[PDB]
């Protein structure tokens, strides 16, 4: 649990696709993708995670933006994505995601940026790293991994 418990601030601010009400408890699982969405390789991972969630409605997906470069507030992209949180399964096209990360004025959330900086240090992962956490299991860094590999780890 301890990852989930120590980080409630951050995890409360990130984009979340809730598992469906009409899925079962045996289907239910918790996927976190942590990705640098300034880079294609991070975006691509999230895209796959989205596609996976689209097919597997027992999963609760949330997405943590974890940029290597911090000159911009991490919280900007995270808010861009959080604003468009309902829309995320309507994506059909890698471009829909790019678009969603491309636009939206937001005021930096410092408390978010702090939360992130904890989460990283206490979870011994670095800024910029791409990884997934699946029901508590950290997998990464990811330096391939597509929606197959999500599927299998669910089994």
Residue numbers in the entry: 673 to 815, 819 to 830
Which sentences did the original study use to describe this structure?
UGGT acts as the gatekeeper in this system because this enzyme is capable of sensing the folding states of glycoproteins as potential substrates. UGGT only transfers monoglucose residues to incompletely folded glycoproteins. UGGT is a large enzyme, comprising approximately 1500 amino acid residues, which has been putatively divided into two regions: an N-terminal folding-sensor region, which accounts for approximately 80% of the enzyme and is not homologous with any known structures, and a C-terminal catalytic domain, which accounts for the remaining 20% of the enzyme and belongs to the glycosyltransferase 8 family. On the other hand, the folding-sensor region of UGGT was found to harbour three tandem Trx-like domains: Trx1 (residues 168–379), Trx2 (residues 467–624) and Trx3 (residues 671–831).
The final model of Form 1, refined to a resolution of 3.40 Å, had an Rwork of 23.5% and Rfree of 29.2%. The crystal belonged to space group I23 with six molecules per asymmetric unit. The structures of molecules A–F were highly similar to each other with an RMSD value of 0.11–0.37 Å for superimposed Cα atoms 94–155. Molecule A in the crystal structure, which had the lowest average B value, was used for the comparative analysis and will be primarily described hereafter. As expected from the bioinformatics analysis, the crystal structure displayed a typical Trx-like fold, i.e. a five-stranded β-sheet with a β1–β3–β2–β4–β5 arrangement surrounded by six α-helices. In the crystal structure, a part of β5–α6 loop (residues 816–818) was disordered. The C-terminal α6-containing segment showed a higher crystallographic B-factor (87.7 Å2) than the average value (79.7 Å2). The α6 helix was stabilized mainly through its hydrophobic surface, containing Phe820, Phe825, Phe828 and Leu829, which made contact with the hydrophobic patch, including Leu703 (β2), Leu717, Phe724 (α2), Val804, Leu806 (β4), Leu811 (β5) and Ile814 (β5–α6 loop) (right). The Trx3 domain possesses an extensive hydrophobic patch, which is covered by the flexible C-terminal helix and can participate in interactions with hydrophobic molecules. Moreover, we provided snapshots of the 3D structure of the third Trx-like domain, in which a putative substrate-binding hydrophobic patch is intramolecularly masked or involved in an intermolecular interaction, offering a key breakthrough toward understanding of the functional mechanisms of this ER folding-sensor enzyme.
